[PDB]
Design a protein around this ligand. Structure first.
Ligand SMILES: CCCCCCCCCCCCCCCCC[C@@H](O)O[C@H](CO[C@H](O)CCCCCCCCCCCCCCC)COP(=O)(O)OCC[N+](C)(C)C
Lengths: 57, 70
């Protein structure tokens, strides 16, 4: 019943954050204070679309 | 004298029989109709009868569920 639509592997390329979990935890509070707007935009998009494929940008 | 004292005219019995026949013919028609209606409702389920219960929709929680994909 239909074909699942999956984005190409090119669509999933991004320059990743290659720091370990300790580095993330050390800077977590300032990261949350500073990067709030893009993060909240993504999360709202995520719970509203209910689809990973609609939230890549 | 016997007819005057104890009995009644033919018209009384005649019309009473007409009324009784009407009542019982209506009852027979209603019985057939009831059987047909019961068969139809039980087969279809679109009437007030034979309505079997289903899950209430007021039980579902409509809130973010700690995960975007529910
Ligand atoms: C020479 C005479 C020859 C003929 C003799 C005839 C004697 C008749 C006796 C037998 C009669 C049997 C009864 C037949 C009918 C009784 C039941 C019913 O059909 O009658 C009821 C009425 O019954 C009578 O009121 C009472 C009959 C009781 C007869 C008793 C006779 C024997 C009594 C013995 C007692 C002895 C004395 C005590 C000793 C200790 C209802 O009538 P009703 O619905 O209104 O009629 C209305 C008619 N309209 C509409 C046209 C106006």
């Amino acid at each position: 019943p239909g074909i699942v639509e999956l984005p190409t592997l090119e669509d999933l390329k991004v320059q990743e954050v290659k720091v370990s979990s300790s580095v993330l935890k050390a800077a977590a509070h300032h990261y949350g204070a500073q990067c709030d707007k893009p993060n909240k935009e993504f999360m709202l998009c995520r719970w509203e679309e209910k689809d990973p494929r609609r939230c890549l940008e | 004298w016997i007819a005057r004292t104890f009995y009644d005219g033919p018209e009384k019995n005649y019309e009473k029989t007409m009324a009784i026949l009407q009542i019982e013919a209506e009852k027979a028609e209603l019985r057939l109709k009831e059987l047909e209606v019961r068969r139809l409702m039980r087969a279809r389920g679109d009437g007030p009868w034979y309505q079997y219960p289903t899950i209430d929709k007021a039980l579902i929680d409509h809130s973010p569920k700690t995960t975007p994909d529910n």
